[model samples]
Target: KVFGRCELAAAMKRHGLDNYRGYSLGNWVCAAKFESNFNTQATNRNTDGSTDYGILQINSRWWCNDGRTPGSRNLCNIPCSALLSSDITASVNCAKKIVSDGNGMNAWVAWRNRCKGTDVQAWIRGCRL
Candidate 1:
């Protein structure tokens, strides 16, 4: 619970996220729920020979490649598995910026709504925690 919904909202605000399609928090929760069940330490090694780690399912091998070796102290130099043990909020924020930049928020909103529904009323119908 290092960074739950409230912390996520605050982090978004701190990171200058105002154009987030009015669903940043909802999208974040949905992504986290679908990917990790909000565990923050979830991990999966895809059959494509890479690992997806942490709440936002970051493919660290895809992102952290500055050629400074794998375990360097650089913010982007940590191992993929460390996503399980590091700051979960940082992982989600990093995933937000790296995965889709500014275009992913709305896509996430749509995807999440598809998984559950498009509105609070729809979400309450059959959605499970």
Candidate 2:
């Protein structure tokens, strides 16, 4: 599903991703926009053979088990396919694990290069959540 900004924010908050692991909810909201443009079905294959999946775009190398990614830890212990849904439950859950693992939002290059240190208020602005 292609989510509008506020719709994504509400979903994140509902799934407990809001402020999970010290990163602001807006950071997650903004990163989602830049990472996959709020498309839950979005995916990208890395040069290393690992793939990124879902709105948070969690990596298969260390987070989800894709069966094809070498040396996968499956830290989230979830099938990478779980993230491909519009529901976002699995995506947010996996991302929470990613953040709590100490990688934080920096795990996502889009966050580091774009949303990090920015005034992310506008990312979730006008959202009542």
Q: Best candidate per TM-score, number?
A: 2
Off by over 4 Å in 2: none
* lDDT string, candidate 1, 5-85, tens digits: 555445544554433445444555556656666566776765655556676666644554334335433334556555675
- Highest-scoring model, lDDT: 2
Candidate 2 has a TM-score of 0.94
Q: TM per model?
A: 0.56, 0.94
Candidate 1's displacement at residue 8, Å, is 6.3
lDDT of 2 at 54: 89
lDDT of 2 by residue, 27-105 (tens): 9888999999999999999999999998888889988998898777898888999999978998887787777766677
Candidate 2, run of 10 with poorest lDDT: 96-105
